[PDB]
Amino acid sequence: SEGNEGVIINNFYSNQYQNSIDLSANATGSDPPKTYGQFSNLLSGAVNAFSNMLPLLA
Amino acid sequence: PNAVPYIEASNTAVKTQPLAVYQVTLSCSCLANTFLAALSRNFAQYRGSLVYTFVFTGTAMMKGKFLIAYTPPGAGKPTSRDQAMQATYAIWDLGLNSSYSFTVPFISPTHFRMVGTDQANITNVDGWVTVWQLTPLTYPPGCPTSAKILTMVSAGKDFSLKMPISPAPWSPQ
Amino acid sequence: PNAVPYIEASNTAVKTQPLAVYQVTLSCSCLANTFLAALSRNFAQYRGSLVYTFVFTGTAMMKGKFLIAYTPPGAGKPTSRDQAMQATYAIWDLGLNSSYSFTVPFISPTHFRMVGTDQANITNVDGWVTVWQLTPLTYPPGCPTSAKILTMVSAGKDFSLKMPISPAPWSPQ
Amino acid sequence: ENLSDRVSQDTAGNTVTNTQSTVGRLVGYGTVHDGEHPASCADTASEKILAVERYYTFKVNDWTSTQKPFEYIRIPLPHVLSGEDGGVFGATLRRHYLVKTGWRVQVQCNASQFHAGSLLVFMAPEYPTLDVFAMDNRWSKDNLPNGTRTQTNRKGPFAMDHQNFWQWTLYPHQFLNLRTNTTVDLEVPYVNIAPTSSWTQHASWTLVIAVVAPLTYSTGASTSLDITASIQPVRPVFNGLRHEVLSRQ
Amino acid sequence: ENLSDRVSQDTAGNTVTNTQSTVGRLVGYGTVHDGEHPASCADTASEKILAVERYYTFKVNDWTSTQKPFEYIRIPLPHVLSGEDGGVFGATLRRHYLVKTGWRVQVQCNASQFHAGSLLVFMAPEYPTLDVFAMDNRWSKDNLPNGTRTQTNRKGPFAMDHQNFWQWTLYPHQFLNLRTNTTVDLEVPYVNIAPTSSWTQHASWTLVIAVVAPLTYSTGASTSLDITASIQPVRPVFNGLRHEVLSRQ
Amino acid sequence: GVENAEKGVTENTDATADFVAQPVYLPENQTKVAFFYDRSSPIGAFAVKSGSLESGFAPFSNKACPNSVILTPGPQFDPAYDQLRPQRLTEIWGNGNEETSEVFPLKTKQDYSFCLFSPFVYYKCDLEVTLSPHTSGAHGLLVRWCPTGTPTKPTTQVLHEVSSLSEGRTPQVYSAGPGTSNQISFVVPYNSPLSVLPAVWYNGHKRFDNTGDLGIAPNSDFGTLFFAGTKPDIKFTVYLRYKNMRVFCPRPTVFFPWPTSGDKIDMT
Amino acid sequence: GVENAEKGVTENTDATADFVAQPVYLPENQTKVAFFYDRSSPIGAFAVKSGSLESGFAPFSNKACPNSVILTPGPQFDPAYDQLRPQRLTEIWGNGNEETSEVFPLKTKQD
Amino acid sequence: GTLFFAGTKPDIKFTVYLRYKNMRVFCPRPTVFFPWPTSGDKIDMT
């Protein structure tokens, strides 16, 4: 059930603050999101296709 | 405390001699200056994958194979490559590609692990990463007989940290 | 204070001799260590059924009958099986089935009854559960002439408790 | 003699238990170990080893006329099966860091229709055992009911290893009453402070055998009743494979 | 340095092998061990133990300038992995009567572009090993090619443990040619006189390492090349569970 | 009703089974676990050291009225090191330690009520803490709360003239003014790395070395509290309140002494 | 996983790349930057001069406990001019200034 | 900016605390050096 609290008013602090956050873990693991934000260093020119090419060795 | 960013491979494979032994603790004096460790020291617990990256810096003419293992706790640290080989490990072959990224899997009874040590953690901590030579560094005439392997650490995509606190204050000097 | 979890049936039925007499009070020193009593001591009042369970532990070869009675207060505790038999009672016959569950009905002027006693409760309390032999324990040759009957207590589906408080502090030693 | 809806068998690998006088299997907490992987481990578990999911049978002790009420014997798990008597279970267990398992037990003891007495068999999580997690050696009434306190702690009320045996039936249990049965069958699920256990330093469950109504009989009746047990790990799941523990002892 | 469609990894449990100079995996007889139960056993097998299906890596020996053509080293299976170095494989193996398995091997040896020489690595069913089924200790050309005959058998033409090494390539094999590769990868299915094996007295498969073109190099080049191997049991299936073999040795 | 208790389970009845009666049920909600522990109870009296408001913290106790407290309902302290940082214990220490001594009042710090009645093996909850100064005059109190398993040696003063408790980004609370009500209240989250906490005993060691000492599971508390303040002579009581309590696996409670007297008890 | 760190960027993995494993992600928000710095931390102790409530202000410090403060997390003060208006510094000053001295508690004011 | 103080208890000192509201940071860079434990293979606290 619930405890000993019987106030009519909506809790002034939201729940994620008033209480701990119950989480549940699934047995088989979970995939991290793909990206944690948009910060990134980028590697360009990695590959090919296009230059002063095919004078270039085989 | 004469820290260098690398380990040295030799022309001899002693199964009894690790090239490196790191404790898997975000408190290892080994990690003390990595961003991982500096970041982590402001939180109470962590979870997830740790990534040890090795960059071979020797000659192109050299050749060799390493056995990198992660040993969970319980039976103490392995004392020979033969015991390490009984745990999680990978064989790193030298060739065109310069580095090797070894991920130590989060193996733990609790969902999270404490970041920092209170006192020092024994024979505990969460196990060990040991690096061994499988085959010796081999080379042709006219080439040095040892090479430096750069060692770095990072978080895996799995890695999480929780509850911000403050480490014990220190002075870099 | 040399508590044992059982009562002993004998090979004699004295209508004048109860095998046990329990006061129906969640304070009986008799119940002092039952979960019922330990639970109950944190509340002010109770209501509902109390269940006294008897497990026969004698030989399979033994036979016997018990008269278990509940006497409400008002006229004092019964002094012979003949007086007990005038109140609420059950006859327990020994046979294939090992135990007997006796429920003392909540008979009271008030909707609820106080859990604990302030002082000691006289000749009061809420009456008594008395156990008597109807017929003696009978047996064949080669068998012991007395047996132990395990005694337990629990709440009935009826049972309720209200108003959480704290008992007087104590030390188990 | 023993009958009908009381005649029961339990097959475990190449192991099978039979009783002709059961009273049913008490499943504690009303659930069984599901054999599911611990969500705290990234490594895939080694599970479903047939050679491991069977009954290990050995002797507990001897029940005599002398035992007093509430004297008991403790069997710490998984520890008791971590040695040589643990077979492939033990062998696998000693090379893994972590184990997650349920237990299925049967304790046995016969007498006759002319004997009287009863045992209480229960299984309890975090029950206080010997330091070294070994089966008790002899019956004892040791440190009941207030726990073990320090020598000097003259006035201390009690210690945290207290055990009020008057309430031992709060634990999943069954009675081995000589007039009624010869066997007791219990099963418990996995319960612990964490999703899997570092069994090495924690005996999370204890099988306890206690006398509640002392052994009685007339002359010529059997005089000492042996007590044996069959223990089976229920869908154990291992993780964190490394070299052997070794000093297994 | 080593390249591209030559860079290859093989994951086994918590084990993974990498090479940067492969020539492919030779699958002998063109089939792999299916992991199917032996039809000669009524008992259900213990199979699919993750802790067992991985690579065991240890050292074979040292390749030197001195080895002559056709000198070899034998590694009897499953025997080599039946001890302490066999991990849970060994431990399970010692408590079962019978085992049915395939093998997946990788043998390793690096030199440089200034070294010359080649090894022949092959796997052979019923190859004649030491009595005691142990890995050879030193390189030998022992009892090639006519087998071992009795002392007195002065005029005997040959013995049944003959081995005409000129034809060793009839066996599933790959060459470890220093100018070409650093690793050799082989896999063999289950083959035997019966549907499963009483491994205790039979080493049905032998991994053989032989020199075919002796080691050559100029001064300052590495002088002794270590030879190591990674061996993995492929879907082993165990039957006939009993107590431990014990003298495991 | 005839029954067979050996099965380990017994059918529940009301007076209705054997006699001519009626069930007498009436609803109540005070027996729910959450409701029962959702009230404050004291764990002991504490003190602040002189001039701690402006200097390095150091373990210290006034009359076995220390400086810091571990947030846990279980025993802790050990009056023999009243001047050392407190620790969790596996037994409660009486008031005196020799025959002629007394059990009450206890010397160690604990939720005696919780100890006396916790019929469960494991529990989970949030902790509401109340600090109450034993004075109705002004009182200044600085509190530092450290999650379980984090640094608990708030010993180095880094800022000249500032308490070492008052350092960092670790939660610090401070009440001190002429118009305060002197008391402090707040609720802390559940920070053990453990899924659920041992309520009485934990049958395992601290290291895999089995340097044998069973009882307490590591990091199974709600953290440590450090105090600094201005009335080094006033003591304050610390109270715990279990917010949204959850318990698992019933188990026995503390033994109650046989009345080698009547056939009933009372109070005290 | 084989890689080439020279590129200046390294592919991130989980135990899943080289072994038989599973990802073990669980959400948390305490690592966001805003959340992390959105808590109070001290920068030092200050003092007021006698009768400043009714007279001209003047730089002054009590025990290297000055009168005014620059709002910045960086170092400032310079204990040598405890009686001068404070200034931002490029180094933190130890508690003492000679061998036998001590680093904590610091004399300058900073977060 | 700068803060100037005047008051009535010239003998009481006060602590000043900062709290960063809606922090935004750009370009990661290194943090302060931590001394090599010329001791163990781990640290602690203080």
UniProtKB/Swiss-Prot annotation, chain G:
The record's subcellular locations are: Virion; Host cytoplasm
Q: Which residues form the signal peptide?
A: none
Superkingdom of the source?
Viruses
Q: What function does this protein fulfil?
A: Forms an icosahedral capsid of pseudo T=3 symmetry with capsid proteins VP2 and VP3. Together they form an icosahedral capsid composed of 60 copies of each VP1, VP2, and VP3, with a diameter of approximately 300 Angstroms. VP4 lies on the inner surface of the protein shell formed by VP1, VP2 and VP3. All the three latter proteins contain a beta-sheet structure called beta-barrel jelly roll. VP1 is situated at the 12 fivefold axes, whereas VP2 and VP3 are located at the quasi-sixfold axes.
Give the protein's recorded name: Capsid protein VP1
